[PDB]
Amino acid sequence: APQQINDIVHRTITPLIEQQKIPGMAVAVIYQGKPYYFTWGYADIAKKQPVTQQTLFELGSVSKTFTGVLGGDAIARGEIKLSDPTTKYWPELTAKQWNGITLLHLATYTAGGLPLQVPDEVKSSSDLLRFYQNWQPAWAPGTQRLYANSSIGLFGALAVKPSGLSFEQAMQTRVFQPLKLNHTWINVPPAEEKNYAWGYREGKAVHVSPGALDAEAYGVKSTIEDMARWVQSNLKPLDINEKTLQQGIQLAQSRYWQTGDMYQGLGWEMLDWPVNPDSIIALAARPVKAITPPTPAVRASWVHKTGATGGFGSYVAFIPEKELGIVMLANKNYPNPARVDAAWQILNALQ
Ligand SMILES: O[C@]1(c2ccccc2)CCN[C@H]2CCCC[C@@H]21
């Protein structure tokens, strides 16, 4: 690595690991299409397995960026439209509160207060239907944003219906494969278990538990290499040869709603660059302003997503205009502000 990148990364991440007692971490900085990798500590403490560039980490809600782009790809394929009513793809959803709730609302957490978590008791397709039928919105659609797995999760599930594919098959064939993300998984195969880090929560080794809509909302596992490739693909979508995927990426970074200084994309969230770092809670209900029509992807943006599972904490951010991106993968769920601080310190110094 160029010594500047080495120095800013080590000087930022070493203290972060110490302060947050992070067992293992991988970091990629992508500068002008070139990735630079850094690793520390342990994928598995008990077995003394180090973090490497091949270690799989649970991305948690960083998975929603994949779902948002898969949904964009389906729009580009002409399979769905964000303006479509939810009921067009799930006509069994007959309760009257669904009138007026579109795929856009689901994708952007603006349906009117869908809950953060799908309840553990919800297993089957018939359980899920019952859950959504019974849900009572707090707000009219398109008025408030409440971050929710039950919202974008449903979007992901409906977005792949016309394709005929399972969600996982659609993601593999339409997103992972074309982008050469060959060590990115919704389900980690037995052959890859040797590389699957344990998460640590209160000192105990843990992996994410199955749940409904897990694939769609928080179920992707990936390596620092594939995640760097993912960030670069989103940084520079015009290099992508597959037309609908290129377009889907662009759609996921369009600005659909504004709350405060943040703009909601599909999975991705965006702020204008340069950002006040200060500008970048279990439930936070925020009124949104519709951006009518959505602004196409703005190059001078800080585009990012945080993600966690019980034992993992991930973060990706990039700035198209500066050809600069970063991925931070850790096998402990440590506070989001520490992630953003570190990422901003690194990118600002290189920018
Ligand atoms: O820029 C590359 C890359 C690879 C791995 C991580 C980040 C970026 C390298 C050259 N080809 C490009 C091909 C298209 C995706 C990104 C890559």
Say what the resolution is, in angstroms.
Answer: 1.7
Query: Hey, whose CA ends up nearest to atom 1 of ligand 1?
Result: 33
CB-CB contact of 231 with 314 (8 Å): no
Comparing CA positions, the residue from 140, 141, 143, 162 lying closest to residue 79 is 162
The reply to whether 195 sits in an annotated binding site is no
Give the three-state DSSP class for 35.
Answer: strand
In this structure, what token pair is assigned to residue 287?
């009124």
Q: Which of 223, 225, 232 has the most ligand 1 atoms within 8 A of CB, as the residue to mutate?
A: 232
* Torsion angle defined by CA atoms of residues 69, 199, 9 and 320, in that order, rounded to the nearest 10 degrees: 10
CB-CB contact of 222 with 186 (8 Å): no
> How is domain 1-351 classified at the architecture level of CATH?
3-Layer(aba) Sandwich (3.40)
State yes or no: is 61 an active-site residue. yes
CB under 8 Å to 266, separation ≥6 — which residues? Answer: 67, 68, 69, 71, 72, 107, 108, 251, 252, 254, 256
Element (H, E) at 315: strand 312-319
- Cβ neighbourhood burial of 288 (10 Å; 0-12, 13-18, 19+): buried
CB under 8 Å to 302, separation ≥6 — which residues? Answer: 270, 271, 272, 273, 275, 280, 317, 318, 319
In this structure, what token pair is assigned to residue 6?
């080495």
CB-CB contact of 179 with 230 (8 Å): yes
Comparing CA positions, the residue from 94, 80, 210 lying closest to residue 158 is 80
Give the three-state DSSP class for 76.
Answer: helix
Instruction: In whole angstroms, give the CA distance from residue 257 to residue 134.
Output: 27
- Cβ neighbourhood burial of 239 (10 Å; 0-12, 13-18, 19+): exposed
CB under 8 Å to 316, separation ≥6 — which residues? Answer: 62, 65, 227, 230, 231, 304, 305, 325, 326, 327, 328
Q: Is 182 in the pocket of ligand 1 (CB under 6 A)?
A: no
Element (H, E) at 272: strand 269-272
Experimental method: X-ray
221 forms bridges with which residues in the sheet?
58, 185
The reply to whether 117 sits in an annotated binding site is yes
| Atom number, ligand 1, closest to the C-alpha of residue 233 | 15
Radius of gyration of the chain (CA): 19
Query: Hey, whose CA ends up nearest to atom 2 of ligand 1?
Result: 33
The reply to whether 247 sits in an annotated binding site is no
**Neighbour tally for 120: CB within 10 Å:** 10
Residue type (1 letter), 238: L
CB-CB contact of 110 with 288 (8 Å): yes
**Residues comprising the chain, all counted:** 351
